[PDB]
Design a protein around this ligand. Sequence first.
Ligand SMILES: O=C(O)Cc1cccc(CNC(=O)c2ncnc3ccsc23)c1
Length: 167
Amino acid sequence: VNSFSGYLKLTDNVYIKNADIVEEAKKVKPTVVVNAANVYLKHGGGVAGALNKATNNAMQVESDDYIATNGPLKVGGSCVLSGHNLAKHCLHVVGPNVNKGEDIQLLKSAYENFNQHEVLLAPLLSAGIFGADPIHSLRVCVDTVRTNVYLAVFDKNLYDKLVSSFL
Ligand SMILES: O=C(O)Cc1cccc(CNC(=O)c2ncnc3ccsc23)c1
């Protein structure tokens, strides 16, 4: 029994809710929040810009030190950093950005990173400004992630379509 509330159950291990992931993180303070990162950990916009803003830019400062030491992530890769005021940990996961011509097949690899964590609060990878079809992202999530994932979908009309079209 954990502290997530108001989610619709899609499968044995995948749950979904129409929510702002920032507000959900501040309310639940989960062990792991997933960021929709890019390989440079430049948290400008979308989920990343919103999470970073909620940390008063501390996420960006930590991220810049990580990149200065380690170099960029891979598309499909991840790193674990602090969750600051929002979570114990932030798992920064890089889904492919369709708007940059990255291979959508890397979306499955991106979701595999979730399996290293028992429970996560997460957005749909490669959705929103990353340009992939969110219905496809949800299907890859369900078919790839085996740990317990609580998906926060910002847009209510998308959250209604995702739930109504779910197989
Ligand atoms: O909500 C999120 O977490 C990510 C997000 C945030 C803002 C705007 C979008 C873009 N909207 C959509 O892709 C969308 N909307 C409504 N019906 C559909 C049906 C197929 S795509 C689609 C996505």
